[PDB]
Amino acid sequence: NNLVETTCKNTPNYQLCLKTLLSDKRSATGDITTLALIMVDAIKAKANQAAVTISKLRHSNPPAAWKGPLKNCAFSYKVILTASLPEAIEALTKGDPKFAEDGMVGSSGDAQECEEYFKGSKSPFSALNIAVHELSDVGRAIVRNLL
C-alpha cells in the first residue's frame, strides 16, 4: 500500500498500476516480487481474452481485410502466452528479474505490432491490445526497480 503507491509512481502509468494492484488481494501483504507477479497475471488475463476473441473472429466469416492481421495476431498472442509470460513468471519465481523484463519487453512489442496491422482500418479489439501493451510497460518498470 505504502510500497504499492511508491512502486506505481516509478511506472509509465501510475493509475493503471494502482488500479491493477489494488484490485488483487495479494497486494496488501506482498513484497515487490509479488506486485510484479500480480501485474504479469493481469497481462495474461487480457492476452488470453484477446486470443479467444481472435479465434472467434477468424472462424465467424471475417472480413477479407481482417484475415491477415488476425492470422498474424493469433501468433503474436501465442508468443506472449506460451513463451514471454511463462518465462517472466519463471524468472520472478525462481530466477532473476533481467529475463522478466525481456518477457515484458516482448509482450509489449507483440501487442502493439498486432494493433499496427489494423492501422488504416477499424481495429476490432483495440482496448485489449492497448491494455496488454500498457500492462507490460508498467510490468517492465516494476521489474526494472529490482535490478
Beta strands in 7-124 (DSSP E): none
**Distant-in-sequence, close-in-space partners of 112: CB < 8 Å, separation ≥ 6:** 129, 133
> Is residue 48 within 8 Å of residue 81, measured between CB atoms?
yes
Query: What are the contacts of 46-50 at 24+ separation with CB within 8 A?
Result: 46/128, 46/131, 46/132, 46/135, 47/77, 47/80, 47/81, 47/85, 47/107, 47/111, 47/132, 48/81, 49/128, 50/77, 50/111, 50/114, 50/125, 50/128, 50/129, 50/132
The three grid cell numbers given for residue 29, joined into one nine-digit string:
501483504
Query: What DSSP element (H or E) covers 48?
Result: helix 32-58
Q: 1-147, what's its fold? A: Butyryl-CoA Dehydrogenase, subunit A; domain 3 (1.20.140)
Task: For the chain, report the end-to-end CA distance as a whole number of angstroms.
Answer: 22
96 marked as binding residue? yes
The experimental resolution of this structure, in angstroms, equals 2.4
110 is in an annotated binding site: no
Structural domain spans, the chain: 1-147
E strand or H helix at 22, and its extent?
helix 14-22
Q: Which three three-digit cell numbers place residue 107?
A: 509482450
- The one-letter amino acid at 57: L
DSSP 60: S
As a whole number of angstroms, the distance between CA 92 and CA 101 comes to: 10
Q: How far apart are CA 76 and CA 89, in angstroms?
A: 18
CA 16 to chain centre: 12
CB-side exposure of 86: number of CA atoms within 13 Å? 7
Q: How many residues does the chain have?
A: 147
Q: Which three cell numbers stand for residue 13?
A: 502509468
Angle at 37 between CA 70 and CA 146, to 5 degrees: 115
